[PDB]
Amino acid sequence: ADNLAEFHVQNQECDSCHTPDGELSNDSLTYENTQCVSCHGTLAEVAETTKHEHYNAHASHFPGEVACTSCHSAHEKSMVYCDSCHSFDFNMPYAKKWLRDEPTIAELAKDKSERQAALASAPHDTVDVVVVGSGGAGFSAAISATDSGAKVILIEKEPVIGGNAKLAAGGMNAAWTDQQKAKKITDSPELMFEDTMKGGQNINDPALVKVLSSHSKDSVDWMTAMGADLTDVGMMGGASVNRAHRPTGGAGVGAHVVQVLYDNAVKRNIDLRMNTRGIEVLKDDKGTVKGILVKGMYKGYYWVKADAVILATGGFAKNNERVAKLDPSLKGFISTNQPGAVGDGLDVAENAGGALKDMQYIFAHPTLSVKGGVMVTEAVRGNGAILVNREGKRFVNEITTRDKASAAILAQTGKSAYLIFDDSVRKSLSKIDKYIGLGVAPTADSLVKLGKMEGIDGKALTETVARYNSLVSSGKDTDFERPNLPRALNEGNYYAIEVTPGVHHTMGGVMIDTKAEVMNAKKQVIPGLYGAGEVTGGVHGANRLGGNAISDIITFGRLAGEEAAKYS
Ligand SMILES: Cc1cc2nc3c(=O)[nH]c(=O)nc-3n(C[C@H](O)[C@H](O)[C@H](O)COP(=O)(O)OP(=O)(O)OC[C@H]3O[C@@H](n4cnc5c(N)ncnc54)[C@H](O)[C@@H]3O)c2cc1C
Ligand code: HEM
Ligand code: HEM
Ligand code: HEM
Ligand code: HEM
Ligand SMILES: O=C(O)/C=C/C(=O)O
Ligand code: NA
């Protein structure tokens, strides 16, 4: 057979997969996927038949209920979503190579006739609020608005939920929590505010940073009440004390928080539509929001009538052409992001009248794995790892801020460096076991043996670790002034991870006020239009601090949902 439907129709009727009238159930293909599951079993049952020692297409780190049609189309060949970041050895029936080819919002002007027909029709649905994007900001705003009394529709352009938030590792910053008190830490919302303004070179909007620090404990309390575990508290650069919260043992904060938000949306019966892209905000004759035009992958263009629209579409760090226009030094670099993080949400905001700010400030994460092409969290360094070059020596403060770590790594022999750690560091952060499972953390019982494996001067490496352990013991790093020295590297075996920089977060974006209301260039509010998360500018300023982005999306996402509900 040439395709999957042709294969099944050799011994099955069309209604084995389709509804009685033959029409597609909706853009999420809910009915059709239910039939795949009735015969083959759930994703977890299918995964028992496709095991590999260290990977499995049907059992991954993605949260929520991943639909079979995310990767298996029926009437045409299709792509494996995992190939957008990894290169595993797979053999999916009727596959084709991964290629992302999505028209820009400007290119969709080509569909004038279909768009005009949709807008002349009655609205397909009439609700109070529409939320655009299924990352942390978007789920937070849909749950908040629903709990306040509003009827919502939440849309997502990709086949799977969670955006870049499902990948988060290091933690969520907050201050003066009960979680901190149980680990004997002393902090305050005022210290969190001060660290954040210094971190962004005092370019941040102080009104927005006051919302970020003052609502942080409440945001941790809200997530925990919905079922989250945010009890492990670690350190990341730029923080005066430990304040990055994550699940017990040091697991990743992102897949866990997105799973808790999805389960709470399902409990509240929130209308969630996959494969549905927001295209154009609609306004009445007085310039206030009246609804939004969307494009369903399977059902076509239609529009939804509503009092408010909340844009929660994330950043543009995967779009290297747009990145290079703003910062030529980043042209050609790899990215840490999901395939759809390209900035189409900003284009929708701008067409509606919103102004942008701080677009030139773009962060390249210093440590992506050379072998695996994926981010290695700053928490590996925060829990104690060091960085060495091919000469076997230290060369930078590993928890330094701004762009100092990426610049220092690019200046070393080969334009890359190595993270070095032991079994005490490994046992302190469970996320490290995920890098060992991927095959990117070679190990040996001595530093001389490990250097011989990876091309690092082994005798100099041994001396370098002995010296660093001496500075940990005395309590001061006189070589590079690293301000936190949590453990000596001296238990069990040693590990190395080869790293280099990659494009990661866009700190600029749409202008918002303290109520998450979008504004134009004259600072006038556009009634009914809201923005929250990485699509906004002004929270982080000229440089970001690790752990502040997840704090931002929960706080500003919940706030926008409450405000849009009251406005409606
Ligand atoms: C690998 C990785 C690890 C990270 N780790 C951390 C961490 O530990 N701590 C931290 O503070 N930050 C971390 N960050 C940053 C933080 O996760 C992001 O800034 C956060 O994902 C922003 O969330 P958001 O809700 O604004 O957007 P996202 O989570 O990116 O979600 C946006 C969603 O909107 C959808 N969308 C876009 N345009 C449209 C459209 N037109 N119509 C419909 N849907 C659309 C997208 O497809 C996407 O699913 C990390 C980032 C990455 C990439
Ligand atoms: C989109 C919906 C479905 C998906 C994604 C799916 C998935 C698959 C795949 C990938 C194969 C292997 C093809 C090959 O070897 O070339 C397969 C085969 C098969 N499918 Fe499906 N399927 C779907 C619907 C169904 C339904 C509704 C039924 C039963 C009525 C069914 C029964 C079978 C059977 C019997 C086989 C052959 C092997 C076996 O005995 O399991 N499938 N399916
Ligand atoms: C001769 C038998 C079939 C007929 C006439 C038929 C008809 C159609 C039509 C007309 C569409 C497109 C609808 C639109 O664009 O609005 C479609 C899509 C689809 N059909 Fe079928 N179908 C048949 C068999 C199957 C089988 C056996 C399966 C599953 C194994 C299946 C699953 C799907 C799915 C998942 C879609 C969405 C798009 C895609 O994945 O290709 N159909 N079908
Ligand atoms: C309940 C949901 C799904 C069903 C029922 C389904 C069905 C199947 C079946 C029947 C096979 C062939 C297995 C064999 O007999 O060897 C298969 C293979 C495969 N499917 Fe799925 N699939 C589902 C979801 C997905 C998703 C969401 C993805 C990607 C994220 C995916 C990617 C693959 C790949 C990559 C293979 C080949 C695996 C390998 O070579 O180890 N499938 N699927
Ligand atoms: C269903 C699709 C995918 C599968 C089956 C898969 C599989 C894996 C596996 C086997 C690992 C090693 C650790 C573990 O066992 O969990 C891993 C790690 C990782 N993957 Fe994926 N992957 C998928 C999609 C993606 C995509 C699309 C991205 C990026 C947008 C991504 C980013 C990462 C990262 C950053 C890690 C490092 C460890 C961590 O942060 O937990 N993966 N993946
Ligand atoms: O885990 C990380 O290093 C990413 C942190 C962040 O972007 O805040
Ligand atoms: Na931003």
UniProtKB/Swiss-Prot annotation:
Changing R402 to K/Y: Reduces activity 10000-fold. It is found in: Periplasm. Induction: By anaerobiosis and fumarate. Changing H61M: Reduces catalytic activity 5-fold. Reduces affinity for fumarate. Keywords: Electron transport, FAD, Flavoprotein, Heme, Iron, Metal-binding, Oxidoreductase, Periplasm, Transport. One of its GO terms (molecular function) is metal ion binding. PROSITE patterns: MULTIHEME_CYTC. One of its GO terms (cellular component) is outer membrane-bounded periplasmic space. Heme c 2 binds at H8, C36, C39, H40, Y94. FAD binds at A137, E156, N164, A165, A169, G170, G171, G278, Q338, H505, E534, A549, I550. Binds 1 FAD per subunit. Heme c 1 binds at C14, C17, H18, A74, H75. Fumarate binds at T377, E378, R402, H504, R544, G547. Residues 118-568 are annotated as: Flavoprotein-like. The active site is at R402. Its EC number is 1.3.2.4. Gene3D superfamilies: FAD/NAD(P)-binding domain, Flavocytochrome C3, Chain A, Succinate dehydrogenase/fumarate reductase flavoprotein, catalytic domain. GO terms for biological process: anaerobic electron transport chain; anaerobic respiration. Heme c 4 binds at H61, C82, C85, H86, K431. Succinate binds at G170, H365, T377, E378, H504, R544, G547. Its cofactor is FAD; heme c. Flavocytochrome that catalyzes the reduction of fumarate to succinate. Is essential for fumarate respiration during anaerobic growth, acting as the terminal reductase. Receives electrons from the membrane-bound tetraheme c-type cytochrome CymA. In vitro, can use the artificial electron donor methyl viologen. PANTHER family: FAD-DEPENDENT OXIDOREDUCTASE 2 FAD BINDING DOMAIN-CONTAINING PROTEIN (PTHR43400:SF7), FUMARATE REDUCTASE (PTHR43400). Monomer. This is Fumarate reductase (cytochrome). It comes from Shewanella frigidimarina. The gene is fccA.
